[PDB]
Paper text:
Here, we present the first crystal structure of the extracellular domain of YknZ from Bacillus amyloliquefaciens. From the diffraction dataset, the crystals were found to belong to the orthorhombic space group P212121, with unit-cell parameters of a = 44.2, b = 46.2, and c = 87.5 Å. The refined model of Ba YknZ ED contains 188 residues from Asn58 to Asn256, and the N- and C-terminal regions of Ba YknZ ED were disordered in the crystal. The YknZ ED structure included a mixed α/β domain that was dispersed into upper and lower subdomains. The upper subdomain was formed by residues 103–219 and was composed of a seven-stranded antiparallel β-sheet with four α-helices. The lower subdomain was formed by residues 58–102 and 219–256 and consisted of three α-helices and a three-stranded antiparallel β-sheet. The DaliLite server revealed that the structure of Aa MacB PCD was highly similar to Ba YknZ ED, which was found to be the top match and showed a Z-score of 20.1 and sequence identity of up to 22%. We also found this crevice in the middle of the mixed α/β domain in the Ba YknZ ED structure, where it virtually divided the domain into two parts (Upper-right). The most significant structural difference is the number of β-strands; the lower subdomain of Ba YknZ ED contained three β-strands, while the other structures each contain four β-strands. The purified YknX protein was not bound to the CNbr-activated region, which is in sharp contrast to the strong binding of YknX to YknZ ED.
Author numbering: 16 to 33, 39 to 148, 156 to 214
């Protein structure tokens, strides 16, 4: 019962204005009829570093709805709290693979990993294939200057709402951005 929103401007759209979702967008969507939850992330590739070890990782800056909806399961340590998202703490939850690459069999919990030159305390390792770390989206703003989400889905209350909620959510997006039909769900 989730549907993803995409940004694809038409030629009619591009020649009026020479994938971006704002915080305003994420907050608006939550109030769209039929929306149970908003699933939002900013996905970026970069190197992560601990001591003498380097690996390439996926860093996901997410909102509070993302964990909610995604069956993301922490095996050791803890998951994010709503205040972690609020304050944008320098806190990260890492996959088993990236923990193994950077730490081997040593516990990563409490250690500082440097992602793209930014320090992040590992507060959780996920249940078990990819090297990826999750951090509060608000941490991306201050640390990397990332102020938009790259990927957004909405979860509906029921399956029969997808078509209409999806459409409404897409219109809302277009209206916030002043675009005609750039934002859309699959028809």
């Amino acid at each position: 019962n989730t549907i993803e929103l995409f940004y694809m401007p038409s030629d009619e759209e591009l020649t009026a204005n020479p994938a971006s979702f704002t915080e305003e967008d994420i907050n608006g969507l939550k109030g769209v009829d039929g929306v149970k939850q908003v699933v939002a992330s900013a996905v970026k590739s970069m190197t992560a570093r601990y001591h003498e070890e380097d690996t390439d990782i996926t860093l996901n800056g997410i909102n509070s709805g993302y964990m909610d909806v995604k069956k993301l399961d922490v095996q050791d340590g803890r998951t994010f709290t709503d205040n972690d998202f609020l304050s944008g703490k320098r806190a990260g939850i890492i996959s088993k693979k990236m923990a193994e690459k950077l730490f081997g069999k040593t516990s990563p919990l409490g250690k500082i990993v440097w992602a793209g030159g930014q320090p992040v305390e590992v507060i959780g390792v996920l249940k078990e294939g990819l090297s990826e770390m999750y951090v509060p989206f608000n941490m991306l703003k201050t640390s990397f200057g990332t102020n938009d989400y790259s990927n957004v889905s909405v979860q509906t209350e029921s399956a029969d709402q997808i078509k209409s909620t999806g459409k409404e959510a897409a219109r809302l997006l277009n209206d916030n951005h002043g675009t005609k039909e750039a934002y859309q769900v699959m028809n």
